[PDB]
Design a protein around this nucleic acid. Structure first.
Ligand SMILES: [Mg+2]
Ligand SMILES: [Mg+2]
Ligand SMILES: [Mg+2]
Ligand SMILES: [Mg+2]
Ligand SMILES: [Mg+2]
Ligand SMILES: [Mg+2]
Ligand SMILES: [Mg+2]
Ligand SMILES: [Mg+2]
Ligand SMILES: [Mg+2]
Ligand SMILES: [Mg+2]
Ligand SMILES: [Mg+2]
Ligand SMILES: [Mg+2]
Ligand SMILES: [Mg+2]
Ligand SMILES: [Mg+2]
Ligand SMILES: [Mg+2]
Ligand SMILES: [Mg+2]
Ligand SMILES: [Mg+2]
Ligand SMILES: [Mg+2]
Ligand SMILES: [Mg+2]
Ligand SMILES: [Mg+2]
Ligand SMILES: [Mg+2]
Ligand SMILES: [Mg+2]
Ligand SMILES: [Mg+2]
Ligand SMILES: [Mg+2]
Ligand SMILES: [Mg+2]
Ligand SMILES: [Mg+2]
Ligand SMILES: [Mg+2]
Ligand SMILES: [Mg+2]
Ligand SMILES: [Mg+2]
Ligand SMILES: [Mg+2]
Ligand SMILES: [Mg+2]
Ligand SMILES: [Mg+2]
Ligand SMILES: [Mg+2]
Ligand SMILES: [Mg+2]
Ligand SMILES: [Mg+2]
Ligand SMILES: [Mg+2]
Ligand SMILES: [Mg+2]
Ligand SMILES: [Mg+2]
Ligand SMILES: [Mg+2]
Ligand SMILES: [Mg+2]
Ligand SMILES: [Mg+2]
Ligand SMILES: [Mg+2]
Ligand SMILES: [Mg+2]
Ligand SMILES: [Mg+2]
Ligand SMILES: [Mg+2]
Ligand SMILES: [Mg+2]
Ligand SMILES: [Mg+2]
Ligand SMILES: [Mg+2]
Ligand SMILES: [Mg+2]
Ligand SMILES: [Mg+2]
Ligand SMILES: [Mg+2]
Ligand SMILES: [Mg+2]
Ligand SMILES: [Mg+2]
Ligand SMILES: [Mg+2]
Ligand SMILES: [Mg+2]
Ligand SMILES: [Mg+2]
Ligand SMILES: [Mg+2]
Ligand SMILES: [Mg+2]
Ligand SMILES: [Mg+2]
Ligand SMILES: [Mg+2]
Ligand SMILES: [Mg+2]
Ligand SMILES: [Mg+2]
Ligand SMILES: [Mg+2]
Ligand SMILES: [Mg+2]
Ligand SMILES: [Mg+2]
Ligand SMILES: [Mg+2]
Ligand SMILES: [Mg+2]
Ligand SMILES: [Mg+2]
Ligand SMILES: [Mg+2]
Ligand SMILES: [Mg+2]
Ligand SMILES: [Mg+2]
Ligand SMILES: [Mg+2]
Ligand SMILES: [Mg+2]
Ligand SMILES: [Mg+2]
Ligand SMILES: [Mg+2]
Ligand SMILES: [Mg+2]
Ligand SMILES: [Mg+2]
Ligand SMILES: [Mg+2]
Ligand SMILES: [Mg+2]
Ligand SMILES: [Mg+2]
Ligand SMILES: [Mg+2]
Ligand SMILES: [Mg+2]
Ligand SMILES: [Mg+2]
Ligand SMILES: [Mg+2]
Ligand SMILES: [Mg+2]
Ligand SMILES: [Mg+2]
Ligand SMILES: [Mg+2]
Ligand SMILES: [Mg+2]
Ligand SMILES: [Mg+2]
Ligand SMILES: [Mg+2]
Ligand SMILES: [Mg+2]
Ligand SMILES: [Mg+2]
Ligand SMILES: [Mg+2]
Ligand SMILES: [Mg+2]
Ligand SMILES: [Mg+2]
Ligand SMILES: [Mg+2]
Ligand SMILES: [Mg+2]
Ligand SMILES: [Mg+2]
Ligand SMILES: [Mg+2]
Ligand SMILES: [Mg+2]
Ligand SMILES: [Zn+2]
Lengths: 91, 50, 112, 77, 63, 252
RNA sequence: UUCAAAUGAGAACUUUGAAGACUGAAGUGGGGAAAGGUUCCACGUCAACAGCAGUUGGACGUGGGUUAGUCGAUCCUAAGAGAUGGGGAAGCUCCGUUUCAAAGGCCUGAUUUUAUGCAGGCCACCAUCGAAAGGGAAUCCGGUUAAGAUUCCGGAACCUGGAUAUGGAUUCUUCACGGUAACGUAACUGAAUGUGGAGACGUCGGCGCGAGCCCUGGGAGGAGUUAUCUUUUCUUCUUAACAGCUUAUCACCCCGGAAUUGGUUUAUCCGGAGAUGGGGUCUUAUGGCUGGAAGAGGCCAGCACCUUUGCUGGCUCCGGUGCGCUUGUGACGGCCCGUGAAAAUCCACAGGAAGGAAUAGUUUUCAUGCCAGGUCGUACUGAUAACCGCAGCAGGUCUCCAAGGUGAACAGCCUCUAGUUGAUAGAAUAAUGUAGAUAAGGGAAGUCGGCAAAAUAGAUCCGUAACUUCGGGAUAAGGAUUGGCUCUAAGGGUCGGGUACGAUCAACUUAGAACUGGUACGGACAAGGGGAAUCUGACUGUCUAAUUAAAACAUAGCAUUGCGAUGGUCAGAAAGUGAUGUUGACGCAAU
RNA sequence: AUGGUGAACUAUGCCUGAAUAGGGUGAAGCCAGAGGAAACUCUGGUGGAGGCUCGUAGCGGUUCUGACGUGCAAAUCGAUC
């Protein structure tokens, strides 16, 4: 039974603060709380634990990540850049 | 209070002893001039300030 | 009906001032102060309570016989069995793989 | 603080040097569901423990009481 | 005496009622009671072979 | 009149930092013999929250080359580094996220964090959640290396300045609206006594250059000069322009 | 508030008895923290003092009273304070606290001139003060006083330090065996050095369990009511620390190899990184049985006699219930740009220096045994009279325990236990008052203004507009219903079933139907007035203690400014000084 | 003016502790169901979010411009908030 037309989790804030700030929060909230895939044991069990700390239910690895999402655009591109620049050093 | 330093206990002790009336035999002495105890103290009219 | 008083001068509900009500042979209720609960020693590697070991407030462990403070296996009352299983395999394999690395690079040197 | 059952082990206490006093207590109790029976408790005061031995058998009780060291300061009831 | 006439259902009409229906008895208590019952009738009917594990595992989620 | 607020901050009475819960200082390894001739292996043992900090810290433990024992260091975690990972610190080390390398041995375009301003100052540049610095040049004679700091400024330092490959973790923290007063509250409650902020213009003249008047107003340019003196500098200190910024910034 | 007695020169006011009430466990109960300091307790006692009195007192006179190895302090560290080589300063002194310092001490060996020099090897920790709520070795029940009690007496324990022997264990395979394993045990050597753990940690929510309280059946006592009725009303029936065996959610192990996916929580999490299933290992919170320990305590009956006061008997038993209440705890779950101390101290492990047997060695982390445990506080009050407010001031002042009904309920109202019945008193009941109420017809015409006051109110059901950030607005508005008594129906547990059902036990909830009354029924208590707009601040929050609570301040949001440390902003008389800074532009600072 | 004494009140920060009846609302997540050619849309439950809301204690101090105004009181008392 669809409970809210649009506020979703942001439903807690009632009428306060004004739609737009609420919309912005909703987005990052949904990222920050959501359950993630663990690169290591392959289960979806990575949940957040204070901004930038991402750690795995089963299997217990902890990864430093973005403040409200595991991997951050920037992080990744840098990860790719570092790939490429490293390659230059063996060949 | 109700759990004191020995310092404070001591003072309170000394205080109790000074809290008698004039020993009436002083009154009889030659040239006696002290009528009563003019430095008497009472727990609910004057506080010790420790 | 019957109520209760503290049994020490401290009148507050601190963690060190827990109270338990109790029925004495006199047929009345009386407070009794209660020590904080002991927590379980933990595995130095993985993190669980390590089984086989007693749980006492830290100084009480000097009033207890050494068998209450270990299990027999290597790294008895310190690491959690499965954890020792693991580090043994890793130890063996790495030391073996180590030898592999050496005879392979000894080969490189005389074939280059 | 202590309970005991080896009627052998007990006797050995009762001659354990520091065991000066001992005491025998008598109890009416009931057997199973029906009737009653005479229970006796054999308490020995070691230097740091009060061992008591409940001889539920009136018979073994009496025989045990003359088993007691003649030098022990038994308190009767 | 009164307490008797309660378990006889008396003194309990709308005029004797000040806490909301939910205060008097939570909805959730009702639920947990009811759900826990179905949940465990399923277990005996399974343990007993009366029901088979495939039927039980659907009735479960359907409960 | 009175001593204005920004002058009382210097004596640090109620104004010191709130420190009781912080993990310790975040610092690279002491630039010893291992790190400047070869490399040395470590293990991140834990990555962990520092109170009043954006980005998580990484406890990373190493072996003492001189005594039989473990000496544990506190790093600021780069995005990606993980419990269990092996970290390599040293001149002759390899170019992957987490390792620590002298800016000399990294090609331009390398992206590193916690960089030293002089070699061995145990880390000084780009430590905040999200931030990093990019190597843009090298000058092998007098071994300098040129980088672009987070601000935008470009600077040159010793090629023996150490950095750590990657960006700092927990980025994006600032995109989430604080929404309410209480979150700023709990925010600064673990930083310093700088919140809330009475406007100088809601004060009385004893209190501020801005105080007083029958309506609320600054009553003179709020761009104050560098040469100004304590008790005078509230407003736009040394402001070289002012007003809504129009069109792309980004330094050229 | 009242009657009487007793006392006394004297009694509205003291004491006792009777009666009427109150506080109503969110106490006018039982204790403490700060603070007081003898007010505590006995005896004597009324000149002052207790705004009447006084034979009474927290007054006055005279005395007595505060018992600790286990309760606190003492130790530890917190914010912080603060000596020291130093650096400033004319100087009083300021800065620095591990800082630009030659900073100090443990284990035993070497002595058999001898008491302790050297021989190693370490360890480089750099004062100290700072918690009677944080951390922390260890005690309980019964009894006892005019006044002390976790402190005395009794009994029964525990910890720490020191000494130590006897027993057991272990060894000719020297430094124990058993278990496939998780791991077991009464023991079962272990230096330096290293490591690990405990101390040690947010908050809310539901769920599970414990304890005490609450409710309750039977039986064995005692008390009350009995014109009539009631196998009735009230009450006693308890079990400490400590110790032996046993007991647990979680976690783990072994067998096994999974789609027709299964298991499974109130809450959707888990399984080829091994689920479901079967078998085991562990923590011992907690509980059970026994020891303690019935000899104690509780309740009764039957004799005794001025006395101290005994003495003799009995009985102290078996159960039930749960969205109960308070508290404790568990496995979970929500939250965070907040992720929620430190140190003393204790243990373990990795290591293997070493020291050790067969003619007899090793072992005190197994048992038993010996000695010792200092110093100071401990009375009482904690408040409408023991503290602060000039005082026995309607003010202020930190906390624990918490029964029955009605009810959602720690509300209000009535009660049990305990504690009070203190507040000058008598006679009248004019005006005007203070506080509490009602008022025909009208219904804001009163007034700056509906100020005051009245109206509304609980619950169940029906019904609900503009507008909106879609979350609300909303209990919108507007309606009906509600007692008593007698029925009905629906909603659960527990057991055996070869590899369809029966038998019993225990619970208020919800709906429906009769009858019934001076049409009453949330019957006291309790308990929102509502609607249409304009101005203004977004909101929650903040302030002028003691004439202003607002539209003022704050705030999220928005924008601007300064700064890459040889720095920005700020402190200081100065400095080898200081705040931001345990900081680094997703930062600090300034509007 | 000079040299001294105060943070037992209060303002603010830090450290370490403690405290808060009973209700209304019903946000994410989750389960089962229904429609539809499809895209997709609907329903009933569960769950227990919020500087949310009714309201004690608490904290506050709005109106009576109530009492009092040589006071209980140099700021109190009552009702309402
Ligand atoms: Mg009772
Ligand atoms: Mg006490
Ligand atoms: Mg063991
Ligand atoms: Mg064990
Ligand atoms: Mg070994
Ligand atoms: Mg619900
Ligand atoms: Mg339930
Ligand atoms: Mg069931
Ligand atoms: Mg399922
Ligand atoms: Mg000035
Ligand atoms: Mg500081
Ligand atoms: Mg502030
Ligand atoms: Mg501002
Ligand atoms: Mg402001
Ligand atoms: Mg102003
Ligand atoms: Mg000015
Ligand atoms: Mg100016
Ligand atoms: Mg102005
Ligand atoms: Mg303006
Ligand atoms: Mg009178
Ligand atoms: Mg009453
Ligand atoms: Mg009440
Ligand atoms: Mg009173
Ligand atoms: Mg007292
Ligand atoms: Mg006093
Ligand atoms: Mg007295
Ligand atoms: Mg007189
Ligand atoms: Mg007086
Ligand atoms: Mg008088
Ligand atoms: Mg008189
Ligand atoms: Mg006297
Ligand atoms: Mg005296
Ligand atoms: Mg102690
Ligand atoms: Mg001492
Ligand atoms: Mg100093
Ligand atoms: Mg100290
Ligand atoms: Mg202490
Ligand atoms: Mg303490
Ligand atoms: Mg005495
Ligand atoms: Mg007493
Ligand atoms: Mg006693
Ligand atoms: Mg004793
Ligand atoms: Mg004894
Ligand atoms: Mg000893
Ligand atoms: Mg053996
Ligand atoms: Mg350690
Ligand atoms: Mg630890
Ligand atoms: Mg703590
Ligand atoms: Mg104990
Ligand atoms: Mg099993
Ligand atoms: Mg097995
Ligand atoms: Mg409580
Ligand atoms: Mg946490
Ligand atoms: Mg341990
Ligand atoms: Mg040697
Ligand atoms: Mg021993
Ligand atoms: Mg000494
Ligand atoms: Mg006392
Ligand atoms: Mg009093
Ligand atoms: Mg006073
Ligand atoms: Mg005075
Ligand atoms: Mg007063
Ligand atoms: Mg009283
Ligand atoms: Mg009066
Ligand atoms: Mg009228
Ligand atoms: Mg009308
Ligand atoms: Mg008019
Ligand atoms: Mg009109
Ligand atoms: Mg007119
Ligand atoms: Mg007007
Ligand atoms: Mg007019
Ligand atoms: Mg009004
Ligand atoms: Mg009327
Ligand atoms: Mg509107
Ligand atoms: Mg409206
Ligand atoms: Mg009816
Ligand atoms: Mg039925
Ligand atoms: Mg406002
Ligand atoms: Mg407001
Ligand atoms: Mg004012
Ligand atoms: Mg003023
Ligand atoms: Mg206001
Ligand atoms: Mg006002
Ligand atoms: Mg705007
Ligand atoms: Mg200098
Ligand atoms: Mg103060
Ligand atoms: Mg509540
Ligand atoms: Mg309500
Ligand atoms: Mg609420
Ligand atoms: Mg279909
Ligand atoms: Mg709620
Ligand atoms: Mg609110
Ligand atoms: Mg409210
Ligand atoms: Mg209410
Ligand atoms: Mg109030
Ligand atoms: Mg307030
Ligand atoms: Mg008022
Ligand atoms: Mg007035
Ligand atoms: Mg007057
Ligand atoms: Mg109110
Ligand atoms: Zn994983």
């Amino acid at each position: 039974a669809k409970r809210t037309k649009k506020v979703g989790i942001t439903g807690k804030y009632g009428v306060r603060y004004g739609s737009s700030l609420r919309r912005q929060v909703k987005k990052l909230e949904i990222q920050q709380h959501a359950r993630y895939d663990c690169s290591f044991c392959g289960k979806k069990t990575v949940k957040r634990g204070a901004a930038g700390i991402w750690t795995c239910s089963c299997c217990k690895k902890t990864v430093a990540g973005g403040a409200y999402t595991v991997s951050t655009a920037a992080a990744a591109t840098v990860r790719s850049t570092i790939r490429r620049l490293r390659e230059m050093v063996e060949a | 209070a109700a759990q004191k330093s020995f310092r404070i206990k001591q003072k309170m002790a000394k205080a109790k002893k000074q809290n008698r009336p004039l020993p009436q035999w002083i009154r009889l002495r030659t040239n006696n001039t002290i009528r009563y105890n003019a430095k008497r103290r009472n727990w609910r009219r004057t506080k010790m300030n420790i | 009906a019957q109520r209760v008083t503290f049994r020490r001068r401290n009148p507050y509900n601190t963690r060190s001032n827990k109270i338990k009500v109790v029925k004495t042979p006199g047929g009345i209720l009386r407070a009794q102060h209660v020590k904080k609960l002991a927590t379980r020693p933990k595995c130095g590697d993985c993190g669980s309570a390590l089984q086989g070991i007693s749980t006492l407030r830290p100084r009480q462990y000097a009033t207890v016989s050494k068998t209450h403070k270990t299990v027999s296996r290597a790294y008895g009352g310190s690491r959690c069995a499965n954890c020792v299983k693991e580090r043994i395999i890793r130890a063996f394999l790495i030391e073996e793989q180590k030898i592999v690395k050496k005879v392979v690079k000894e080969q490189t040197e005389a074939a280059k | 603080a202590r309970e005991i059952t080896d009627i052998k082990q007990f006797l050995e206490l009762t001659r354990r040097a520091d065991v000066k006093t001992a005491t025998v207590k008598i109890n009416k109790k009931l057997n199973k569901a029906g009737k009653p029976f005479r229970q006796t408790k054999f308490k020995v005061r070691g230097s740091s423990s009060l061992y008591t031995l409940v001889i539920n058998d009136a018979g073994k009780a009496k025989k045990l009481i003359q088993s007691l060291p003649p030098t022990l300061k038994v308190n009767r009831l | 005496a009164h307490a008797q006439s309660k378990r006889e259902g008396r003194h309990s009409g709308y005029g004797k009622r000040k806490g909301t229906r939910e205060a008097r008895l939570p909805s959730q208590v009702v639920w947990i009671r009811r759900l826990r019952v179905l949940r465990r009738l399923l277990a005996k009917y399974r343990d007993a072979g009366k029901i088979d594990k495939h039927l039980y595992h659907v009735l479960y989620k359907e409960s | 009149g009175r001593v204005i607020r920004n002058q009382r901050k210097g004596a640090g009475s109620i104004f010191t930092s709130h420190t009781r819960l912080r993990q310790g200082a975040a610092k690279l390894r002491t630039l010893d013999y291992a790190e400047r001739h070869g490399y040395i292996r470590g293990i991140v043992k834990q990555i962990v929250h520092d109170s009043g900090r954006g980005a998580p810290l990484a406890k990373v433990v190493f072996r003492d080359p001189y005594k039989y024992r473990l000496r544990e260091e506190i790093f600021i975690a780069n995005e990606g580094v993980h419990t269990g990972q092996f970290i390599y610190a040293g001149k002759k080390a390899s170019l992957n996220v987490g390792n620590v390398l002298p800016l000399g041995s990294v090609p331009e375009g390398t992206i590193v964090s916690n960089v030293e301003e002089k070699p061995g100052d145990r880390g000084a540049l780009a430590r905040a959640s999200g931030n990093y610095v990019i190597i843009i040049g090298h000058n092998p004679d007098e071994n300098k290396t040129r980088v672009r700091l987070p601000s935008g400024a470009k600077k040159v330092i010793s090629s023996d300045a150490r950095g750590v490959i990657g960006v700092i973790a927990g980025g994006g923290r600032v995109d989430k609206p604080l929404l309410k007063a209480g979150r700023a509250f709990h925010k600064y409650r673990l930083k310093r006594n700088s919140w809330p902020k009475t406007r100088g213009v809601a004060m009385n003249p004893v209190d501020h250059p801005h105080g007083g008047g029958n309506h609320q107003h600054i009553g003179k340019a709020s761009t104050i000069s560098r040469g100004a003196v304590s008790g005078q500098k509230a407003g736009l200190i040394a402001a070289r322009r002012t007003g809504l910024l129009r069109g792309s910034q980004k330094t050229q």
